[PDB]
């Protein structure tokens, strides 16, 4: 449950999560940046839907540009 | 007069029907068929 999973009408959508940044082409999609490796990798996961997806690592907020790719 | 469109018809859509009425004037008798919902 620490990986993105569907949860219809969730109180904690990917969209509001600090780890999420929108897809480069389609703003309906998202990018999960939560999987950050000790050697510096930001191992993204593609989000088909940011309104009805969530996981346990969800944390409301917004990272500055410095902490994104 | 209300006639539901046969569900296997090319123009079938849910709730669709032919409204059919008879008319007659100086020339003669005829029937009109208009699709409705």
């Amino acid at each position: 449950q620490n990986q993105p999973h569907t949860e219809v009408g969730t109180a904690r959508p990917c969209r509001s999560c600090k780890w999420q940044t929108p897809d480069p082409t389609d703003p309906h999609r998202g990018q999960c940046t939560a999987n950050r490796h000790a050697m510096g990798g930001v191992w993204k996961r593609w989000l088909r839907d940011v309104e009805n997806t969530t996981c346990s690592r969800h944390e409301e907020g917004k990272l500055s540009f410095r902490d994104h790719v | 007069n209300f006639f539901p469109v046969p569900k296997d018809a090319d123009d079938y859509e849910a709730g669709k029907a032919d409204c059919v009425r008879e008319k007659e004037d100086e020339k003669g008798k005829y029937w009109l068929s208009k699709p409705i919902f």
Partner: protein, 857 residues
Amino acid sequence: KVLEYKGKKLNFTPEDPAEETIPADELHEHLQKPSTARTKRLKERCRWKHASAGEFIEKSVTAGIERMRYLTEAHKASEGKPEAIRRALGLANVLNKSTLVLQEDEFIVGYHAEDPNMFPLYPELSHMAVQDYLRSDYSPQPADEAAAINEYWKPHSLQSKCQPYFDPADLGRMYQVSSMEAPSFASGYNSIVPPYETVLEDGLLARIKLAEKHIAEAQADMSTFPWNGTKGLDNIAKIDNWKAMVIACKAVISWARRQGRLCKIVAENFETDPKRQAELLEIADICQRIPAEPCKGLKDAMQAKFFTFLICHAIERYASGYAQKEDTLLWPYYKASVVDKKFQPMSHMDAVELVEMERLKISEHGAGKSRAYREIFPGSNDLFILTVGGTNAKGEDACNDMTDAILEAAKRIRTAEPSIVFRYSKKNREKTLRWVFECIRDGLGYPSIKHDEIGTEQMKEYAKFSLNGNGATDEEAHNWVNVLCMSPGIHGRRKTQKTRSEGGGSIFPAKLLEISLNDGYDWSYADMQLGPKTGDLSSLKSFEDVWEAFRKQYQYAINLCISTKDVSRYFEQRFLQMPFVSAIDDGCMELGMDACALSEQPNGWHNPITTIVAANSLVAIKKLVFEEKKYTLEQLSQALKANWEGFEEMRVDFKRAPKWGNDDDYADGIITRFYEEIIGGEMRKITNYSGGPVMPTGQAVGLYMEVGSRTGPTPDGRFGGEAADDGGISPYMGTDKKGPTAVLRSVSKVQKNQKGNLLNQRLSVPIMRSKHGFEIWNSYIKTWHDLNIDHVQFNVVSTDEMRAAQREPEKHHDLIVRVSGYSARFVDIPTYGQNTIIARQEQDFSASDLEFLNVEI
């Protein structure tokens, strides 16, 4: 009454002895004989929609609004989509939502508006034409919605697209319809030769499956490594056209089947007679199968043909006409039904009845055409011209028992429309010729007669100019029909003419002549500059100067005539796609092209109308002003500007000057040059969209009346506003004083640079209805053919009867006469027009005439 010929005394007593004593002034009220009780009923209650003088004859005929409404709804919804698909979506919405109509006693069913008294309108074409309807008593309703619709379409209309590419002054001149017919983009008027053969043989389901296959292959092509952008992008327009074809065809099938379902519903819920109930279910089944599937019998074919006609001529787009080779088209189906009895078994007389019903449906087909075109076909609904006879691919007789069924039905039911063209060859069987004559001797005015070989040769010549080298093959060149009244075109599954922009539209020499004598200024009708300033009166110092002024007037006018058509063509294929017509053309389907874009068989022509007025005027000018110097041009011009008032002696001089149609050397030498060097010679210098020449098709329809009324007095002796000549090459009414064979001799002299020329002739009733009628007529046609004359058509009607029909129209409802290229109900023609027909010389044959024709009794 009696004539002596080769030592015999010929007696011109009627074949039916009863007619010896039937008063001359009511003859045609005795001749109809509908083949069945049903078709008798159908005629008696026929919903005629004749128009004259710009209006409909009957108050009950009025415009529909459904087509306007649903086309508009689709157009708004389809914004952004490819234009070809948008057009398909428009047609589909119209077909999906249209009220359909079924009438009592009908077997062939279907209609093109929401009520049997109505007709649809066309806001996508001419915004002016729609506005004219809104200002009329027969406006679509509700008027406010209709007005709102027209305002929506105006910036998108074909008219609005084409006008910016022309000098506003030039359009104003054309729009007057005085020296030039208005361009089709301004009126919405149009024509078409539908590939009926494809629908009947293949059915629409097959066309759909075929387009879908093309699409899949094209999409596969586009994803194949390695991509080539100089080739692969060609698939875009192709896929658009094919997807549009599928949308259009599926909608047509759905529409046909919904018509079928109305038959079923009426049979089961409304009709109380078990006989009619069974028939209605029979019709319902046909509509279910057809045109989705290939036709199997004659009933199938007739209904398939009617459905195709409605889409091509009324619903997808307006098009005048009924072009088709009906005997050759229906023969395989006649054979299956009547001869082999393999499907829908029928008697020959059953076939005859079915054709009668077709004639009656067409008689009910009201046309949503613009004011001009409600002016120029008086006494009819519209132009509907079908073709029969001629020769097959091997040059042998194409006549058959289906031909005879079509002709007999015409003779029996006596409807003014559809008109018939008979392609005459020495190959044609006498049995069928006799049926042709039965129609003519009854005064129907049709079949008109076309020279088979001239037309076939013509098709071969045009074929050479094909832009993709796929013009008519030599064998295919035998497959031709008249498009509207007069001009040949290919029929079949491919290469047919898709639009009037290819060929059609008129030009008016009489008006051009008038303004030639006034430095291009029209003082008499519009009071404005109508042509180029080709020289004032004093500059016209010789006959050659007059000749050249007309030439320049003609060149200016004809250039506009063709260029406006080609510009229309440019935009039609881009914004007025016809995906249904495209889907049933084998070439369009194969190449993924729109019907207006692809042009495999060139067929360029334009119509000189009021030619002989111009020609007689020139002859008289030469003789009296320049040769004899009896009058100066200033004297003539002063006389003309006075409408000859005070100058009657001058008028009579010009009137009696030599005239076309008298086998007179002086007149004919000048006029022959006029046809060949100017009318044809100059026009032929122009090349149209299709890459072939443009040649003249002389005719007149009702324009010889309307243009006459817009033309001032002319040196042939006309007063201002009098009618012009009635044909392309007819003598001016009442000026042929040397008999019928003198006329043939004049006409035969015009041989170069023509596409065709309409000849009206009127023959003595007693002779034609006598037992000698057929022999004399058959000899006439043989002689006419040997003289290499393009066309002839006949009135056979007493003046007494026409005058009687003027006094008491209600007693002469079945009087039909020939106008020009089409026939009409005489009592539905305005008095002005009626008088021009009465004035046509009724020809008698002298013994020298009969000898010239090599008649044998």
